[PDB]
Amino acid sequence: LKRRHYVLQELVETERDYVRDLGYVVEGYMALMKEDGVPDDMKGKDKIVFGNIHQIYDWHRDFFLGELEKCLEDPEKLGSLFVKHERRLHMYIAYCQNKPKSEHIVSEYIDTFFEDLKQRLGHRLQLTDLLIKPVQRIMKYQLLLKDFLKYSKKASLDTSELERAVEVMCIVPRRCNDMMNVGRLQGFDGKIVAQGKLLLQDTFLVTDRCRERRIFLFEQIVIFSEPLDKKKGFSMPGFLFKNSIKVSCLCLEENVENDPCKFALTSRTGDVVETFILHSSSPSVRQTWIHEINQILENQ
Template structure:
């Protein structure tokens, strides 16, 4: 009975203690107490149980909240009184109670937040730094790649612009080459009008008595010019339409052939004189019978115009070739050729108009300069009186002539009437005249002569050109005379200079 009373008293005490706890704690505590009672009652099954006691309501409202630590302390003091066999179950019970209390006292957590933690996701400081460096490097690589792509695009764009610019200039050059070929065809047709028209008619029909033997002077070597252009030059220029780089080499290769224009221009003044005599009579009659639109002088001037035109076309071709940054070596050579040949042709044509000179003009050497200048011929005691003169400077002589305009027609060029001359080996040069910056003086050193030629140039540059050229030929004459008089001493002097 005393044992039963002790169990009942303990149960009542536990009931009173659990009343102070939350409902869940009380339930767990009561369950643990019942389990413990049952375990103790098993060995005392034969003891008679006392009559049941009336159930009393021991619940009450605590004046203050009991802390979790107090509950744990009470449970620990009670459990410490139990036998060692109950220790394990009591410890489990304490752990369960502690977990329940902890769960009740912790603040509620937002279920939307994931409280799970994966340790594998934790990164060390080095890993974080490495990752940041990798991301930085990737960004830099991306930016560098974009910059390289932009530079490549810019380079491609610039290259396309350069190619477009080059194509533009090559296209312009092609237009000039096409013009060169087209005008060559027209030129050959004009020459054919002379050769197959006038020359054939005059050959197959009797000439007026006054024209006998003059037909060769009228046409000169134009038949030779026609044959070469028709058979060679036209075909060569046609090839240039598909191979523009051939243009320069053509003029260089046929340089000697082109000098036939010099011969034609040398004869041109004589031809003009004869044609002007019979233009309104005989040659007009022939033109009408042939049905030509152009008059004979219009056709005979074509070779002179053509040899001058080549130079202009080559200049344009060279200009566009340079802008297209292509090789211009042969073109530059060709342009030099077509500067020299027309000048020589024009010089000989001008000399061919010189009349009244007793000597043989072709024996005076190469024509170096020609121009229209103001000249005053001064003798001892004479006054200066300047007149316009056409001056021709050859290697052996300088000739002064008067220009006479033709009054017969508009097709004839002026003629030059011989007035005076000085031989180079018997003249001296004074390149300054006091107070006159454009003038220089030539003096005849022939014994017994006191003639002085005061020449006024058109500009200082023009004066410098004439003075430089005259001094050059005077030096050559001096060297030549020294070589004739003292060949050994002259050779030693040349060797010393070397």
């Protein structure tokens, strides 16, 4: 029970820090850029840079920090809070989706315009580090709530509401990673939005020697990509487009050499036929992809 209070104490204290840190962006960077202007070649492009950070800031400042400060004297509320405001936590998905586009503009001005602003504001951190903070916080909720669940489970308390909250803090951070990765794909001809919902995403060894491929399953397309080196200014590595299969051309072979981790995908573009063997990390990933490919092939 002593360690359970420690985790809740840390959660509240870092929430205060989170509002302040977001405040360095909103009422530090954004306010001065709105007052004094931007460089010539950056006009209108600041909406991309910040995404919906102001909306996130508003909600944590005017509402959610106070909600978490009530949990200090009433810890049973904590489980209810993350379930109740599940949809308000979907803001982070929109943030993470925009994040790769944000990183591109910032990296072009980090040493010039934004450095001048950092020097004026007197921040310890650069804008690059401040803009990662919302991504860090959604992961920090998962890390702390899992620990708070762990010590509640040892204390023989009611955990039903708290387990639901933990499951919410699986789905949202994972979608955040999923959407962020998608926007880091380069060399693809055509628009990502024009491919239907992103359904699944994983890394396989692929044989056309086998190489690593990050594979994106959209409703209308399957994209194969090579993992790239992490760039200067970017928080995650990118992905280079290698090949794609349209769902209307797709064929699933479930069994390849009877291996519980292999399956095949075939592309049937006219008279040109190409088969790809996908080696899974585990059997359960194979079962997820097979189910999902069988569902989209059964529509059209």
